[PDB]
Design a protein around this nucleic acid. Structure first.
Ligand SMILES: Nc1nc2c(ncn2[C@H]2C[C@H](O)[C@@H](COP(=O)(O)OP(=O)(O)OP(=O)(O)O)O2)c(=O)[nH]1
Ligand SMILES: [Ca+2]
Ligand SMILES: [Ca+2]
Ligand SMILES: [Ca+2]
Length: 342
DNA sequence: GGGGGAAGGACTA
DNA sequence: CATAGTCCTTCCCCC
């Protein structure tokens, strides 16, 4: 089996560099202004000309202007990028019916067939890269290996605008060298709980009893790690389905009065119903972010689908239930519709 | 004992 | 200090 992973270089930043080629070369930062105080919000992402100076996704926007008070700051237009991605994805299918759109910029193509072996899959990696650059003007990195985890890892650093193959013997090299923290699915929380057990690498997983991995990171996370470390890992490329939609908005100021939070919450529901589009959710969830950046949520599953009116009166209830259970003020409020039916 | 759901939060990207 | 999923642990109901 040979898996080819595609990941578009600084997607949001690059797409904006395309709709206005004049932005190329200079530092570009796609932000997310909440308004709390003008330049409130964080950075969605930033082209590499800006990342070299510390500016990047996650950091507050004000802390970004302090570094590059001359970088072009653009508001995130997620819908434009979502359509460039779709175009670009309905283009990969032309290289394999075995495709999986993991993210808005990440896709996996199973090309165990179309191809030969590496030397060829690699050459199929260059056909895709160039076809994408020609047709949509986007540069992307490509990863090729026995499975997805490694295909995705390979992408790691071939990035940006690169390509890299990880042959079987390289696999059994990283399984012992690559840092456990740079393995897909291992966020700081998990990666940390691992250094606390002595497992600083992937091969160290086979040295510890399964009852302690299942007790720490959980079964699924433990099996996953072990299989990968054993070289037995492979999962298939399966098409994925949207399992939940939502929109969480930022209030101008913290609050705890229902009537003041209503408006914001109702926009979340409205804009969320627009995003559902023909999907009929049977479960509803109202999510809140307390004044001290903590997340609290309440939901309810109905024996049937939810209508716009139902959602309205239901969110209100779950919200009252929230403000009652928690004492803190609310900074952000949103909704999440799931359990569709189709 | 255990399957079957549902709820709420933990964790990742 | 700005969207979602899979996992996950706990709880409740009942054969
Ligand atoms: N809204 C939002 N979007 C993010 C955030 N982090 C990443 N994204 C977007 C940035 C890209 O458009 C897309 C892919 O993210 P990646 O982590 O793979 O990096 P990115 O694509 O920005 O550039 P790269 O892969 O380094 O060339 O997801 C974030 O913190 N907030
Ligand atoms: Ca990317
Ligand atoms: Ca990504
Ligand atoms: Ca990582």
């Amino acid at each position: 089996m040979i898996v080819l992973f595609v990941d578009f270089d600084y997607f949001y930043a690059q797409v904006e560099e395309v709709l206005n080629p004049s932005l190329k070369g200079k530092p570009v930062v796609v932000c997310v202004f909440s308004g709390r105080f003008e330049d409130s919000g964080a950075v969605a992402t930033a082209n590499y000309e800006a990342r070299k100076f510390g500016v990047k996704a996650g950091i507050p926007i004000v802390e970004a202007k302090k570094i590059l008070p001359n970088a072009v700051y653009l508001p995130m237009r997620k819908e434009v990028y979502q359509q460039v991605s779709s175009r670009i994805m309905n283009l990969l299918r032309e290289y394999s019916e075995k495709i999986e759109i993991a993210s808005i910029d990440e896709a996996y193509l199973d090309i165990s067939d179309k191809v030969r072996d590496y030397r060829e899959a690699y050459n199929l990696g260059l056909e895709i890269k160039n076809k994408i650059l020609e047709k949509e003007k986007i540069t992307v990195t490509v990863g090729i290996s026995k499975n997805k985890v490694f295909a995705k890892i390979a992408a790691d650093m071939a990035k940006p605008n690169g390509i890299k193959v990880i042959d079987d013997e390289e696999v059994k090299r990283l399984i012992r060298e690559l840092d456990i923290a740079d393995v897909p699915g291992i966020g700081n929380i998990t990666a940390e709980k691992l250094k606390k057990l002595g497992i600083n690498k992937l091969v160290d997983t086979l040295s510890i009893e399964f009852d302690k991995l299942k007790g720490m990171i959980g079964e699924a996370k433990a099996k996953y790690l072990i299989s990968l470390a054993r070289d037995e890992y492979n999962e298939p490329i399966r098409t994925r389905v949207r399992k939940s939609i939502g929109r969480i908005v930022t209030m101008k100021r913290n609050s705890r009065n229902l009537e003041e939070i209503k408006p914001y919450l109702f926009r979340a529901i409205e804009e969320s119903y627009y995003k559902l589009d023909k999907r009929i959710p049977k479960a509803i969830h109202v999510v809140a972010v307390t004044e001290d950046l903590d997340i609290v949520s309440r939901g309810r599953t109905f024996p049937h689908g939810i209508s716009k009116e139902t959602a309205y009166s239901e969110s209100v209830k779950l919200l009252q239930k929230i403000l009652e259970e928690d004492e803190r003020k609310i900074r952000r409020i949103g909704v999440r519709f799931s359990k569709f039916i189709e």
